[PDB]
Write a protein that binds this ligand. Structure first.
Ligand SMILES: CNC(=O)[C@H](Cc1ccccc1)NC(=O)[C@H](CC(C)C)[C@H](CSc1cccs1)C(=O)NO
Ligand SMILES: [Ca+2]
Ligand SMILES: [Cl-]
Ligand SMILES: [K+]
Ligand SMILES: [K+]
Ligand code: NA
Ligand code: NA
Ligand SMILES: [Zn+2]
Length: 201
């Protein structure tokens, strides 16, 4: 099939901003993260392109709660209330309850509820880039590797975990399991996946 493109809109909340210090430090870090996300998805004939960026240097336009569900719902609610993107990814400096660092609306890509929330949990920008690729994967119809029986992951190194494992562990994931790929292909059957057909400029 032809290359698919995610036109991505990133929002950085107040906590994240005050954590990085300045506007340039955030732009630098966002470009880092998005560059790696795009790198991970190139192995799926996917391009992830940043088309918009919003930094809340003063206050958040909605409540970012320690609970990912709340924050995610607040994002989708706030977003709906314009642009032209396919997907919205929130990056926060708020530490989510427990060990949770990401949450997403499943199979919502291209819909009005197309979004996810990501905590910048690691000094390495790769940390939040893998989380977002994972979350973005949910938006694209992917489940956890452990929820698909006989799912095969071709990661030869570390613990052999892939991007869509329900837990990161001690090493950041690098590839997509075979079930990830299969589920993404199924999602690309849905007529709603049409918004991924347009290559930006
Ligand atoms: C470093 N932290 C982790 O590895 C935790 C570990 C964990 C696993 C299960 C339950 C709670 C915590 N995993 C996540 O943060 C997942 C995202 C990662 C894999 C990118 C995240 C867990 S989902 C929920 C957790 C609690 C309520 S809902 C997920 O699946 N989003 O897509
Ligand atoms: Ca599009
Ligand atoms: Cl989720
Ligand atoms: K890596
Ligand atoms: K999967
Ligand atoms: Na936490
Ligand atoms: Na891992
Ligand atoms: Zn998940």
């Amino acid at each position: 099939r032809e290359t698919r493109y995610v036109e991505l809109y990133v929002v950085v909340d107040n906590a994240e901003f005050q954590m990085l210090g300045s506007e340039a430090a955030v732009r630098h870090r966002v470009l880092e993260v998005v560059n790696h996300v795009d790198k991970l998805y190139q192995k799926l004939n996917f391009r992830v392109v940043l088309v918009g960026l919003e930094i809340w240097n003063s206050q958040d336009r909605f409540h970012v709660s320690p609970d990912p569900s709340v924050t995610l719902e607040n994002l989708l609610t706030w977003q709906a209330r314009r642009h032209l993107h396919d997907n919205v990814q929130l990056i926060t400096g708020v530490d989510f309850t427990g060990t949770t660092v990401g949450f997403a609306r499943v199979s919502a890509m291209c819909s009005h509820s197309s979004g996810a929330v990501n905590q910048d949990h690691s000094k390495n920008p790769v940390g939040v880039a893998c989380t977002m690729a994972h979350e973005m994967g949910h938006n694209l119809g992917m489940d956890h590797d452990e929820n698909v029986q006989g799912c095969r992951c071709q990661e030869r190194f570390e613990a052999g975990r892939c991007i869509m494992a329900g837990s990161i562990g001690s090493s950041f994931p690098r590839m997509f399991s075979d079930c990830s790929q299969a589920y993404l292909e199924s999602f690309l059957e849905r007529p709603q996946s049409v918004c991924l057909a347009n290559a930006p400029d």
